[PDB]
Amino acid sequence: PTPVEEAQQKTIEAITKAINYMAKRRIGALLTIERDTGMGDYIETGIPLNAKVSSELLINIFIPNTPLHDGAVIMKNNEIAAAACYLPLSESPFISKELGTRHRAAVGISEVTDSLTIIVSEETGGVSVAKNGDLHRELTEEALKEMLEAE
Amino acid sequence: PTPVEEAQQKTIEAITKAINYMAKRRIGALLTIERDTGMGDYIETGIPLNAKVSSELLINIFIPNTPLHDGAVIMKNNEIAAAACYLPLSESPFISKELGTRHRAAVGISEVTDSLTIIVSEETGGVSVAKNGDLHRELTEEALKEMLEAE
Numbered sequence: 475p476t477p478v479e480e481a482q483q484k485t486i487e488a489i490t491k492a493i494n495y496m497a498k499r500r501i502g503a504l505l506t507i508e509r510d511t512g513m514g515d516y517i518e519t520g521i522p523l524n525a526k527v528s529s530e531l532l533i534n535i536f537i538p539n540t541p542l543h544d545g546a547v548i549m550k551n552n553e554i555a556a557a558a559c560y561l562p563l564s565e566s567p568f569i570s571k572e573l574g575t576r577h578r579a580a581v582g583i584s585e586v587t588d589s590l591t592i593i594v595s596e597e598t599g600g601v602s603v604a605k606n607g608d609l610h611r612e613l614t615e616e617a618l619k620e621m622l623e624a625e
Numbered sequence: 626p627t628p629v630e631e632a633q634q635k636t637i638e639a640i641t642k643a644i645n646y647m648a649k650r651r652i653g654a655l656l657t658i659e660r661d662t663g664m665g666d667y668i669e670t671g672i673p674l675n676a677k678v679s680s681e682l683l684i685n686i687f688i689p690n691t692p693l694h695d696g697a698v699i700m701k702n703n704e705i706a707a708a709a710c711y712l713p714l715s716e717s718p719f720i721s722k723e724l725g726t727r728h729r730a731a732v733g734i735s736e737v738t739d740s741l742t743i744i745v746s747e748e749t750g751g752v753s754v755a756k757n758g759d760l761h762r763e764l765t766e767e768a769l770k771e772m773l774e775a776e
């Protein structure tokens with residue numbers, strides 16, 4: 475296991491712990507992981523953090539009615555690059571009509587990048603992932619873990 | 626002004642905007658600024674961030690009942706080094722008796738370092754600063770600004 479691989483495992487553990495905490499409490503969240511398509515244009519719309527990842531910071535960011543909670547967190551590798559970021563809204567007809575702006579923003583960025591976006595619904599606590607224009611809903615903890623390890 | 630001078634003033638504005646936000650809402654806070662005495666031993670007790678300063682991130686860290694709100698933020702080299710850090714509690718018999726652990730921790734670190742620590746009381750929203758073993762209480766925004774500019 476190289477340092478790079480161990481660091482990736484720590485980041486996935488941090489992300490999965492934060493998502494699970496937020497799902498249980500119905501804390502809405504929108505977390506985009508940059509991949510090979512650069513997302514600088516969207517990172518620059520938010521508040522710069524350039525912070526080391528932790529489950530604790532991810533949770534603190536999304537607490538309702540706080541300065542950082544509204545908009546997307548964008549991660550670059552093992553860092554939280556910015557919070558409260560703008561993402562474009564998808565007009566796909568395959569987004570469940572009951573879903574709100576977080577899910578439409580997630581699918582939107584997924585249509586113009588190869589990023590992976592995780593959404594927690596503030597209505598149900600359900601966890602979904604947007605990738606390549608598709609939204610995959612109602613994920614188990616195990617399924618989320620898988621998708622991140624494969625990414 | 627020089628890039629170093631403009632960066633210092635931005636940081637002072639970010640700090641004062643956050644302190645004022647938390648004073649109004651009586652959100653307890655503990656923010657230590659490292660000076661010439663290195664504080665690595667204390668930084669290592671918290672959650673690593675190495676994040677850029679913003680008023681928004683400072684506010685989000687100290688939201689009550691969150692992972693990061695318990696303990697001190699330590700700033701170093703114009704970044705937020707870590708949150709939820711341990712600081713030593715003063716045994717000084719000359720701290721106002723109505724004050725609790727946040728203020729004793731601020732005075733305590735100020736007895737063994739040249740650091741400047743800002744405290745917001747969760748009981749009153751009063752703002753105070755610890756330096757050289759003394760606590761300066763009931764500060765206005767202008768008074769805090771002057772201390773930060775003097776530092």
Ligand SMILES: C[C@H](O)c1ccc([N+](=O)[O-])cc1
Pocket residue numbers: 641642644645648649750751752764765766767769
């Ligand atoms: C930022 C500054 O220290 C300060 C801001 C606001 C208050 N107050 O509402 O009383 C006190 C002190």
Ligand SMILES: [Mg+2]
Pocket residue numbers: 611612
């Ligand atoms: Mg299903």
